[PDB]
Amino acid sequence: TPQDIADRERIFKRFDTNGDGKISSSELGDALKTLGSVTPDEVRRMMAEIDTDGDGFISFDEFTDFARANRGLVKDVSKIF
Amino acid sequence: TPQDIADRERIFKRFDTNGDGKISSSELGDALKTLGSVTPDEVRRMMAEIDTDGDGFISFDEFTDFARANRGLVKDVSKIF
Ligand SMILES: [Ca+2]
Ligand SMILES: [Ca+2]
Ligand SMILES: [Ca+2]
Ligand SMILES: [Ca+2]
């Protein structure tokens, strides 16, 4: 969980572009937006994190395993986006 | 419950643009790329989910509450950011 802190502290600091310790609406929107330009290497890295078996596809079971671990995925992503 | 699956399946099927029942690396990238056009309303609704106290900002505490519950998203996102 020191890794849990590090990654969390890391993402927060990157979203909080003005460094005032909090994320504004504009900051959140700016962060989300930088994915319209998600790099090829970055996509490959995320793919490897969810495609557990490394067969080159995310199966429904692999997606479910991810979703069960991140319940604030589907509720938020499914509904909003 | 039937709605919980119905929801998960709805996101999975939205990502699976060629309909082969699996999500490929290019499909994952396309899904991530839709965040480049996130709308003001969508941002507001994600703020509503994470900004619990309604002050219009996401505190590090508020972010932490979200991240504890979505550890995998956060690990993974943390490499793009
Ligand atoms: Ca800020
Ligand atoms: Ca797989
Ligand atoms: Ca597919
Ligand atoms: Ca707040």
Name the experiment that determined this structure.
X-ray
Task: Name chain A contacts of B42, Cβ cutoff 8 Å.
Answer: 80-81
Would you state the structure tokens that stand for residue A35, as one six-digit string?
Answer: 């994915």
B64 touches chain A (CB under 8 A): yes
Q: What does the DSSP assignment read for chain A?
A: -HHHHHHHHHHHHHH-TT-SSEEEHHHHHHHHHTTTT--HHHHHHHHHHH-TT-SSEE-HHHHHHHHHH-HHHHHHHHHH-
* Cβ neighbours for A12, distance < 8 A, ≥ 6 positions apart: A23, B60, B63
Q: How far apart are CA B17 and CA B20, in angstroms?
A: 8
A31 CB neighbours in chain B (<8 A) are 81
- B56 burial (CB, 10 Å; 0-12 / 13-18 / 19+) is exposed
Supply the angle between the helices A60-69 and B2-15 in degrees, to the nearest 10: 120
- The annotated binding site of A is made up of 16, 18, 20, 22, 27, 51, 53, 55, 62
Q: Which resolution, in Å, applies to this structure?
A: 1.8
Task: Compute how many other C-beta atoms are within 10 angstroms of the C-beta atom of residue A34.
Answer: 14
Structural domain B1-81, CATH architecture: Orthogonal Bundle (1.10)
Cβ–Cβ gap A29/B11 under 8 Å: no
Q: Measured on CA atoms in the order B80, A55, A58, B35, is the torsion positive or negative?
A: positive
Residue of A nearest to B68 (CA): A4
Residue A12, both tokens: 């927060």
Closest alpha carbon to A9 in B77, B38, B47: B77
Q: Is B54 left (phi over 0), alpha (psi -120 to 50) or beta?
A: left
User: For residue B8, what are the CA distances in angstroms to A1, A26, B51?
Assistant: 28, 29, 24
SS3 B18: coil
The encoded tokens of residue B69 equal: 């519950």
